[PDB]
Amino acid sequence: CFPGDTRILVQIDGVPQKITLRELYELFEDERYENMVYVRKKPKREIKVYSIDLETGKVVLTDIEDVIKAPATDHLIRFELEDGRSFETTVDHPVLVYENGRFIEKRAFEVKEGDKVLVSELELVEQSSSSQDNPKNENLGSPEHDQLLEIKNIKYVRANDDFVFSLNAKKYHNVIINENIVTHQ
């Protein structure tokens, strides 16, 4: 899991939005109690989730199974990228790094400084602050970026929220967060 602070890239009403899991989560309703955590299922709008295909390395879109809401109990490791991107995980959560010419899944507490993550590097063009715009898919709609980022700094930090999220969708434990940081079990 990641802190609610973790930004998740999704698609809402055919519009890609990058919003924290605590924010993304809100696009959902119907919360159930299970596994000693909370599970929210069924979006109140058209909510899709941007995920990555490990095998091909492409950014795909899928439907959501539910929202992963769990009481912030453990602490989280933070990864700071050379670009200034940073993401956190419950340390037990595997991180997807691109080393040895392959993609490997290592726990946050198993990841080391100077490690990499896969970034889809594919933006939605409109990086405007807040949800001011939405019905815009103009400006061609074709990006271009092929580069992965190394972790400049890792640290042990504490969960910002009292709940942590990951957003459960198809393929499971595979989502694009922060500045498109890809992770998978």
Curated annotation (Swiss-Prot):
Give the source's domain of life in one word: Archaea
Coiled-coil stretches are none
**Name assigned to this protein:** Pab polC intein
Q: Which organism is it from?
A: Pyrococcus abyssi (strain GE5 / Orsay)
Portion of the parent chain present: 955 to 1139 of 1455
